[PDB]
Write a protein that binds this ligand. Structure first.
Ligand SMILES: Nc1ncnc2c1ncn2[C@@H]1O[C@H](COP(=O)(O)OP(=O)(O)OP(=O)(O)O)[C@@H](O)[C@H]1O
Ligand SMILES: Nc1ncnc2c1ncn2[C@@H]1O[C@H](COP(=O)(O)OP(=O)(O)OP(=O)(O)O)[C@@H](O)[C@H]1O
Ligand SMILES: [Mg+2]
Ligand SMILES: [Mg+2]
Lengths: 50, 413, 83, 411
């Protein structure tokens, strides 16, 4: 229960649609109400999974 | 009484006939298409490299100066100024998207060049004016100032000896002899519409005067006037009719003004509302208060019936040049234009060809000239014969203009 | 190859008489040893002529299989080397 | 100069399909077992060679200290901006999505030679500085319409249309393969082609066979594809459509079902009718209006032709009008022959039984007859197909078209 309470006390994530990927772990994403962005990926996700 | 499926009878089918090579040929095709995939993700060589210079010149900048241009450099914004007050700054400044502040000048400014309506560099924290700016020029009229010559001479607009004569009077002659109009006491017209059947030569006369202009010429893309936002298209009209007043005697060519407004109605309470606001803004900067002076407007359409009578009034569009079909002397001149630069027999006559194109346009005549050479490539020739053109007339016109009158013709001979 | 058993700059000649006898057929087992021994290695300016000449002998044994491997030749050598 | 900008520095990306379209035994023979195993040999070796390529790389320098600090010089959340004007003192002006405009600097390694007001750039968050410039900027609605795969077989697939096959080859394939004939007479090849006729005749096949055997790239447009609701979103996508085709290869564009894109351009009372009618009036402008055209060919296809706008039918825009009539008693044999290629055919049948007796039916009818007769064999527990399958199949397919016209007035 304490492990359940600490993980919920954390800022939420953003949802954004990927247009298409760049090279070397970079993509091209407009969020919802902003310009587009070139960001970095995490460990568990890959370029070929996009 | 027809049923022929039961799970035991399924095993009859896939063992009868090539039990040797059925799966033996199939999974070879299956895993190679899997291997088409597994090469692609193993390559992964997309490489969208952009932005970077050649890596042999920026080495001096990105040693310390780039780190020197992070923290001391400023992310200041540009704004506009309403006014000022005496003995103090008391500067009133808007953004038109953000709020309106009342701020102070900084130390690096001269307090004289803080005139009203001026773009100025504004701090992010205390919002002080730092750097004044040159004024904004409109970005999309620069995109449509042509700055380029399309190569069509007046010798290619044959069949129109009098329509060019009307069009020479309005455009070319006051720009080169602005004397005889005043020295007799007349004024030239300032708006010419072009109307008629399609493919007749509307664009050619506009393309040929862009060659011999010696003046400012502006092509205007028609559907840039129609925008997504409300009132945005009407603002695009204004910036066009301001910079024309700055320089002297600039030409503005619209094209297919059927699209940007043809009729003003309201019965179902709605519809093309935003199109009407852009279209009526075009009218009030065409006639009204503050007449424009030396701005000549050319328009061209295919459907002149469906246009607004507010544009049909002279004073906005003054000369109605129409294009018709060339009778015989026009067409015989057109064949000599479009077939002089091609390998033909040097003894053929063209007046027999101009007979067989009774109701035809300049586009249809050129299509006959291109098609006749295509018959020469159906055979193995390098020059065109008389029967090459005679089959081309039947291919272009007679294959679509008549099918009952040619076989059952015996009412006319 | 057993006649000129020698140093590797004279064993540049190993790939010559190997595949000059191999003008055209399907002997794909040779085409893999035409790749897998001296493939890349990054080779700091020592046997770079030999991997060119090993690729030189990939050029034949490709021009006779009547277009069956010619599409595969332009598919591989367009992607793998110039890429 | 003479060769200003050397024409946009741009290559072309054609298709990657058609690896080996030679499976020509077309039956369960050991050749196709031998041929496909050869294809297995080369692709496995292409896999293993590039597997050795990412394996035996002992080269590490990363970026010899130059790009590595640069990749740390730029921010990690790289953002997207838009130029408004260029103040060339290494301190320019940009615009964000909301319109917040910032007197940003240029933080180097960007040549000031390919940045124009309108070209989108790359920015920071902490100082908003220009780091790079965004390239290719395609809205992801036109990239969907870019074909990567050759779908079906070549000209030997369709069952005999050779008078009109030679027509479309004169305007698409032959000017691209061998443009030496045209300079000897100075005649430009035709640009626009209409495919028209009754439905079920072969219009969609003739585009797919061209898209199979080609060298330039290919674009498909399904009818009401360029229609949106934001009153300017319609004509804006048409500009980007021809922009992508012009920037890439000397390629062709296939826009199908253009009966929903043109009808005689009349003026009426509906307000949503005009943004329909306006988008379809500037396609006229991009096609054969001002400036030039480039090497872009357009292929268009309908069922009905008389309900079109006469501004599109005129030459200059479309130079070929091609009829696809219903077949004859001769090339219809080729339709039945091809659609009965790989099916076990009993020797009792005569192909000319159903051809000569009935003289009305399309090519798409014949494919339905061949599939239905194959279903009748499994319906009565058979592999081979006899005449009695085609007797029941020629009935069951054709009972979807009404009884008749007039009675025996004429004689
Ligand atoms: N009078 C003419 N003399 C020579 N060539 C002509 C003439 N009229 C038309 N043509 C040829 O026909 C082609 C098409 O004409 P164009 O498109 O300019 O007609 P248009 O009236 O502008 O068409 P639209 O009304 O659809 O804009 C031109 O490229 C030109 O070569
Ligand atoms: N001449 C032909 N030879 C071989 N097959 C044909 C022929 N004509 C039609 N077909 C068959 O018709 C199908 C293709 O349909 P088709 O190309 O006629 O559609 P379409 O003309 O676009 O029809 P619609 O106009 O109704 O959309 C294919 O499956 C093909 O098997
Ligand atoms: Mg025109
Ligand atoms: Mg179709």
């Amino acid at each position: 229960l304490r492990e359940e309470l600490q993980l919920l006390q954390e800022q939420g994530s953003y949802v954004g649609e990927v247009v298409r990927a760049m090279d070397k772990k970079k993509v091209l994403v407009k969020v919802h109400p902003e310009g587009k962005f070139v960001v970095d990926v995490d460990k568990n996700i890959d370029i070929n999974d996009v | 009484p027809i049923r022929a499926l039961d799970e035991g009878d399924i095993a009859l089918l896939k063992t009868y006939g090539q039990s040797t090579y059925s799966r033996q040929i199939k999974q070879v095709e299956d895993d190679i298409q899997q291997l088409l995939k597994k090469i692609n993700e193993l390559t992964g060589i997309k490489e969208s490299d952009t932005g970077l210079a050649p890596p042999a010149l920026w080495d001096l900048a990105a040693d310390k100066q780039t780190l020197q241009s992070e923290q001391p450099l400023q992310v200041a914004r540009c704004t506009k100024i309403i006014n000022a007050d005496s003995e103090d700054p008391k500067y009133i400044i808007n953004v038109k998207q953000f709020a309106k502040f009342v701020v102070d000048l900084s130390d690096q400014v001269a307090p004289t060049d803080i005139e009203e309506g001026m773009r100025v560099g504004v701090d992010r924290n205390k919002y002080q004016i730092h750097i004044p700016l040159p004024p904004k020029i409109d970005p999309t009229v620069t995109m449509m100032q042509v700055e380029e010559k399309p190569d069509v001479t007046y010798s290619d607009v044959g069949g129109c000896k009098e329509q060019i004569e009307k069009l020479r009077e309005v455009v070319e002659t006051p720009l080169l002899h602005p004397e005889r109009f005043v020295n007799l006491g007349i004024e030239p017209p300032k708006g010419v519409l072009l109307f008629g059947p399609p493919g007749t030569g509307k664009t050619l006369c506009a393309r040929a005067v862009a060659n011999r202009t010696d003046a400012c010429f502006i092509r205007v893309i028609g559907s840039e006037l129609v925008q997504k936002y409300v009132g945005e298209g009407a603002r695009m009209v204004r910036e066009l009719f301001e910079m024309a007043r700055t320089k002297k005697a600039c030409l503005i060519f619209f094209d297919e003004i059927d699209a940007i407004g043809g009729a003003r109605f309201d019965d179902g309470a709605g519809g093309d509302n935003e199109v009407q606001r852009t279209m009526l803004e075009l009218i009030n900067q065409l006639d009204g208060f503050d007449p424009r002076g030396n701005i000549k407007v050319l328009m061209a359409t295919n459907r002149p019936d469906t246009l607004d009578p507010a544009l049909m009034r002279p004073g906005r569009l003054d000369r109605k040049i129409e294009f018709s079909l060339p009778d015989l002397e026009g067409r015989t001149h057109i064949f000599k234009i479009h077939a002089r630069s091609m390998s033909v027999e040097r003894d053929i006559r063209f007046e027999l060809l101009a007979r067989l194109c009774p109701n035809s346009t300049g586009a249809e005549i050129r299509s006959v000239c291109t098609e006749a050479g295509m018959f020469a490539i159906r055979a193995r020739r390098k020059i065109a014969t008389e029967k090459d053109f005679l089959e081309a007339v039947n291919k272009v016109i007679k294959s679509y203009a008549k099918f009952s009158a040619t076989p059952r013709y015996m009412t006319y001979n | 190859a057993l006649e000129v058993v020698s140093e590797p700059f004279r064993s540049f000649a190993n790939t010559l008489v190997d595949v000059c006898a191999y003008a055209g057929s399907g002997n794909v087992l040779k085409v893999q040893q035409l790749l897998h021994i001296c493939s890349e290695h990054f080779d700091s300016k020592e046997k770079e002529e030999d991997k060119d000449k090993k690729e030189k002998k990939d050029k034949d044994k490709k021009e006779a299989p009547a277009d069956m491997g010619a599409h595969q030749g332009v598919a591989v050598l367009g992607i793998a080397l110039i890429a | 100069p003479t060769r200003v900008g050397k024409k946009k520095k741009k290559t072309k990306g054609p298709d990657a399909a058609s690896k080996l379209p030679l499976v020509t035994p077309h039956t369960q023979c050991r050749l196709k077992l031998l041929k496909l195993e050869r294809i297995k040999d080369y692709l496995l070796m292409e896999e293993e060679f590039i597997r050795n390529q990412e394996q035996m790389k002992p080269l590490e320098e990363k970026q010899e200290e130059e790009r590595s600090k640069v990749d740390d010089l730029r921010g990690t959340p790289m953002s997207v901006g838009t130029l408004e004007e260029i103040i060339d003192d290494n301190h320019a002006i940009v615009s964000t999505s909301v319109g917040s405009e910032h007197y940003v600097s240029i933080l180097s390694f960007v040549d000031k030679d390919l940045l124009e007001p309108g070209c989108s750039v790359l920015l920071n968050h902490k100082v908003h500085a220009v780091i790079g410039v965004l390239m290719d900027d395609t809205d992801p609605l036109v990239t969907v319409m870019k074909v990567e795969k050759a779908p079906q077989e070549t000209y030997a697939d369709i069952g005999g249309l050779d008078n009109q096959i030679q027509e479309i080859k004169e305007s698409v394939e032959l000017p691209l393969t061998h443009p030496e004939y045209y300079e000897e007479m100075g005649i430009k090849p035709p640009k626009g082609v209409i495919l028209y006729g009754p439905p079920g005749t072969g219009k969609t096949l003739l585009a797919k066979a061209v898209a199979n055997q080609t060298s330039a790239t290919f674009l498909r447009v399904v009818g009401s594809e360029l229609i949106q609701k934001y009153l300017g979103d319609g004509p804006k996508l048409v500009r980007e459509l021809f922009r992508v085709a012009e920037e890439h290869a000397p390629s062709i564009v296939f826009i199908d079902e253009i009966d929903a894109i043109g009808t005689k351009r009349y003026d009426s009372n509906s307000g949503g009718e005009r943004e329909i009618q306006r988008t379809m009036l500037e396609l006229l402008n991009q096609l054969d209006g001002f400036d030039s055209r480039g090497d872009v060919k357009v292929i268009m296809a309908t069922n009905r032709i008389e309900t079109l706008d006469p501004a599109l039918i005129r030459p200059g825009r479309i130079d070929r009008k091609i009829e696809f009539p219903l077949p004859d008693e001769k090339t219809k044999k080729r339709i039945f022959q091809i659609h009965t290629s790989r099916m076990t055919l009993a020797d009792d049948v005569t192909l000319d039984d159903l051809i000569m007796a009935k003289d009305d039916l399309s090519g798409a009818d014949i494919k339905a007859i061949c599939t239905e007769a194959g279903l009748m064999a499994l319906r009565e527990r058979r592999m081979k197909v006899t005449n009695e399958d085609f007797k029941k199949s020629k009935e069951n397919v054709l009972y979807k078209k009404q009884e008749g016209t007039p009675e025996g007035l004429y004689l």
